[PDB]
């Protein structure tokens, strides 16, 4: 298994530079640097090569989070807004293989986060998304690119909100470079049972996003990382774990995660360092 972490850690918004990060993850002995694809999309190209050329030299894998605005809604019943969306991904996936990204992950099949003062169609919005991503996952394979559908809590999405209706998505999207990503933040919201969620999702699982039920470290809370180790032993998963903890109020990062108080003791980059190499160590413990 490869240990990451979402870069958005240390930020307060999602377009910044990532080089710095590539070094930081390194010297914290993970394997996996998870970036902002918003971030990538309108970088000169100078700096997407800067960007593969560090990740070479420190042999970090570079990985891309998406959430698609309203504007790049893939799954809108506005023809205009569809299509705006599958050239926006397009020109995503151009950035990503100059800087030599495979994976791209979150909600790449619609638009984040959902506004629920206007009325929707789920049904109708789920056929859009799978044409959607089977043309998506057609342009990908030029640049070997996989997208992870993630399954998200009810508050966020209203299309995948449980590994049931994620595994049942990508069988009918029946593309191999389109993969279920879980996360346990919102498997610990929609889910029976979090372990069993893994195991139901089993060979169609392509990466797991990991923090506490209020998005602290592995090791904060109360989730049951034992249970979740064995689960992920029983589907035999070799595949990439991702920590993602947002504990920063104030940003575009705490406005978007919806965070309105502090979870980080005011903590300074230093002291988020300090922390995640504990969670790390902490998390491969669990996970024997």
Do not use: C
Not at 223 to 235: F, R, S, Y
């Amino acid at each position: 298994m490869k240990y990451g972490v979402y870069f958005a850690y240390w930020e307060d918004s999602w377009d910044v530079d990532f080089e710095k990060y590539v070094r930081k993850v390194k010297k914290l002995g993970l394997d996996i640097l998870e970036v902002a694809a918003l971030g990538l999309v309108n970088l000169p190209e100078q700096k997407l090569e800067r960007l593969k050329q560090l990740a070479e030299q420190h042999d970090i894998i570079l990985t891309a989070g998406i959430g698609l605005p309203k504007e790049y809604d893939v799954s809108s019943t506005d023809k205009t807004v569809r299509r705006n969306g599958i050239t926006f991904v397009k020109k995503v996936m151009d950035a990503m293989h100059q800087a030599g990204i495979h994976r791209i992950g979150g909600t790449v099949y619609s638009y984040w986060p959902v506004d629920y003062s206007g009325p929707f169609d789920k049904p109708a919005a789920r056929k859009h998304s799978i044409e959607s991503v089977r043309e998506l996952a057609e342009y990908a394979r030029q640049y070997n690119i996989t997208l992870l559908i993630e399954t998200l809590n009810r508050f966020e999405q209203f299309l995948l909100n449980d590994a049931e209706e994620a595994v049942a998505y990508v069988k009918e999207v029946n593309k191999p470079n389109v993969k279920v990503m879980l996360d346990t933040f919102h498997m610990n919201i929609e889910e029976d049972h979090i372990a069993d969620a893994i195991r139901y999702t089993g060979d169609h699982l392509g990466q797991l996003h990991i923090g506490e039920a209020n998005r602290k470290v592995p090791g904060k809370g109360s989730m049951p990382w034992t249970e979740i180790g064995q689960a992920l032993k029983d589907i035999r998963y070799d595949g990439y774990v991702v920590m993602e903890p947002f504990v920063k109020t104030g940003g575009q990062v705490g406005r978007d995660i919806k965070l309105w108080r502090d979870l980080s003791g005011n903590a300074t980059e230093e002291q988020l360092d300090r922390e995640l190499a504990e969670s790390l160590e902490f998390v491969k413990a669990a996970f024997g």
